């Protein structure tokens, strides 16, 4: 909502020690505890190339956009009840703002 542009060398440090544990930022790493995120921008929820999703994440079909990605990041359990992502949710919007720029740079 109060988005502010970041830089690749900042968002990566966070994602690499917060999201890396289960996910993959590029398309060379096999699907770990979480699906591949490389190319989600512009697609609906539940579209990983070779990985299954929950009954609630599919029915949800959220169009992963710049602001929308934060909507779910703040609380995955509240938006998608029953989802496998048990990461906790990064409540601080200023902190996600920079994270979006990094992923955004990797997808486009
Ligand atoms: C492992 C415990 C996880 C951590 C840490 C993070 N995520 Fe996650 N995420 C995980 C799973 C297993 C799933 C699928 C949920 C299901 O029930 O099927 C997800 C999904 C997402 C998605 C949506 C993918 C899609 O719908 O195609 C996004 C955009 C996403 N996760 C982002 C994300 C970020 C940026 C994280 C760090 C803050 C993060 N996840 C950590 C498991 C895990
Ligand atoms: N629609 C959209 C949103 C965010 C991105 O990083 C790319 C494309």
Curated annotation (Swiss-Prot):
Cofactor(s) this protein requires: heme c
Modified positions (N6,N6,N6-trimethyllysine) in chain numbering: 77-78
InterPro entries reported for this sequence: Cyt_c-like_dom (IPR009056), Cyt_c-like_dom_sf (IPR036909), Cyt_c_1A/1B (IPR002327)
GO cellular component, one term: mitochondrion
This protein's record includes keyword Metal-binding: yes
Binding positions for heme c per the UniProt entry: 19, 22-23, 85
Induction info: By oxygen at the level of transcription. Expression drops rapidly when the oxygen concentration falls below 0.5 uM O(2).
Coiled-coil portions: none
Entry keywords, A to Z: Electron transport, Heme, Iron, Metal-binding, Methylation, Mitochondrion, Respiratory chain, Transport
UniProt keyword DNA-binding, yes or no: no
Signal sequence coordinates: none
Gene Ontology biological process terms in this record: mitochondrial electron transport, cytochrome c to oxygen; mitochondrial electron transport, ubiquinol to cytochrome c
Listed transmembrane segments: none
Cofactor binding description: Binds 1 heme c group covalently per subunit.
Subcellular localization(s) per the UniProt record: Mitochondrion intermembrane space
Post-translational modification summary for this protein: Methylation may enhance its transport into mitochondria. Methylation occurs in fungi, plants, and some protozoa, but not in animals. The precise role of methylation at Lys-78 is unknown, but it seems to preclude pro-apoptotic activity, possibly by lowering affinity for APAF1.
Similarity comment: family membership: Belongs to the cytochrome c family.
Something else known: Present with 7330 molecules/cell in log phase SD medium.
Role: Electron carrier protein. The oxidized form of the cytochrome c heme group can accept an electron from the heme group of the cytochrome c1 subunit of ubiquinol-cytochrome c oxidoreductase. Cytochrome c then transfers this electron to the dinuclear copper A center (CU(A)) of the COX2 subunit of cytochrome oxidase, the final protein carrier in the mitochondrial electron-transport chain. Isoform 1 (CYC1) is the predominant cytochrome c during aerobic/normoxic growth.
Protein name listed in UniProt: Cytochrome c isoform 1
Gene source species: Saccharomyces cerevisiae (strain ATCC 204508 / S288c) (Baker's yeast)
Lineage: Eukaryota, Fungi, Dikarya, Ascomycota, Saccharomycotina
């Amino acid at each position: 909502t109060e988005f502010k542009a970041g830089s690749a060398k900042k968002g990566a440090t966070l994602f690499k020690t917060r999201c890396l544990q289960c996910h993959t930022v590029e398309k060379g790493g096999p699907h770990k505890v979480g699906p591949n995120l490389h190319g989600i921008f512009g697609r609906h929820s539940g579209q990983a190339e070779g990985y299954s999703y929950t009954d609630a994440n599919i029915k949800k079909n959220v169009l992963w956009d710049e602001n929308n990605m934060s909507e779910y990041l703040t609380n995955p359990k509240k938006y998608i009840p029953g989802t496998k992502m048990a990461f906790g949710g990064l409540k601080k919007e200023k902190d996600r703002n920079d994270l979006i720029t990094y992923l955004k740079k990797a997808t486009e």
